[PDB]
Ligand binder design. Sequence first.
Ligand SMILES: *[C@@H]1O[C@H](CO)[C@@H](O[C@@H]2O[C@H](CO)[C@@H](O)[C@H](O)[C@H]2NC(C)=O)[C@H](O)[C@H]1NC(C)=O
Lengths: 215, 226
Amino acid sequence: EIVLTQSPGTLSLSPGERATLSCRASETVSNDKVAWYQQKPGQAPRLLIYGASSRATGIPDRFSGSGSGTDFTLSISGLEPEDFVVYYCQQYASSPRTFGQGTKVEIKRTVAAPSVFIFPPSDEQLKSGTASVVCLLNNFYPREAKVQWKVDNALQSGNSQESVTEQDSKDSTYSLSSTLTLSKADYEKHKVYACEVTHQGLSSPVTKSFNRGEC
Amino acid sequence: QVTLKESGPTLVKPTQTLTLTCTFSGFSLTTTGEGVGWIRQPPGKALEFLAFIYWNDAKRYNPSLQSRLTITKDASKKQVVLTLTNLDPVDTATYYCARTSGWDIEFEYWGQGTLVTVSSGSASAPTLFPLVSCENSSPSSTVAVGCLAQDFLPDSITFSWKYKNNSDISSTRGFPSVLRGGKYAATSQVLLPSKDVMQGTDEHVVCKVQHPNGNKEKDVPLPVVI
Ligand SMILES: *[C@@H]1O[C@H](CO)[C@@H](O[C@@H]2O[C@H](CO)[C@@H](O)[C@H](O)[C@H]2NC(C)=O)[C@H](O)[C@H]1NC(C)=O
């Protein structure tokens, strides 16, 4: 059972910079049978490096592997557009083969505060017994945002999902949707609905809300 | 060029059995060191190794999934088979097979995956609801409206927004889907310039989705500003 810890989980560099992803093993890895894979969301992994340092067939030279024992490094100097994906290290010294959780390399951009909108549940869906309040956060950066729901001032929990897009191809920004889903019964028992969003680019927390029916 | 192709049921109920097959071409399970294995990836998470089978028919398993896993090769048909019993939703994921071409070159060739959703529910198409910006206290920049494709399976929709004057819109706002009680929900939104909506007769725009179980298409009412 060789556990593999990769860090950072997410790394934020600019194109052209150098990137050093680290992979640490929970014990020494016999013969350094460690490999690195690259994956773009959607596609399948592709081998980049094997035997801790040996490049592969048709894999550029900014990609280099090093280290041994329980410390390994996948460094890629001169980050190019297509290099901003996820990366996994794996050890095949034993088998059980095991993987690391992956570190994602993202494009650093400047702070963009989000624009937020709140949508009340539609009558139609309401007739269905379930009402879904949504709160959309548009074009923001960095990725971290706190999105809290409050109903009649009551902080909510375990009743909202959350989905976030991948970094925008032309913007480098993110958008996210937070959904509050509750029983039509519960929904009609309350008056004010509010989603509070906290983000590094807002001087103070922005809160959006509407009153049941008055919309 | 070497090649692998996976295939299997794209939907299956729990407490059951999944069988996947990696049909490969370009090599034979005969050379030393050479081997093939199955690795899955739950949506949004990391790669996870299941089982591996060597030429010489030596098989190796992931403890945590062993005694539920079974790997086999048919040199006859050039296709390795994987069997997973007691399916659970947590077993939903993309399943890949890959070939290690030697002793050190690990998984140099990967298949392409096949997403295997594990829900007791049945392949239902989306049911749509409009999302109208209950916006105000500052309309501002532009106005936004959405569309909530609900209760579908398998996860596989697309969005296209069209006008009354049946043209096309610039939404790009498509959020990945969220899994709610065996069924998947998704949101899509779109921004229109405040100037346009506060004018035209267009009392709406239409939301269009193409799920393989039905191609519903509801219409969402703009808000009227000026
Ligand atoms: C559909 O309706 C919108 C208005 O809600 C139209 O937008 C205006 O018309 C032009 C013609 O294409 C657009 O390019 C502009 O966005 C709007 N004009 C102005 C004054 O800027 C839209 O064009 C209509 N769709 C069609 C059939 O073109």
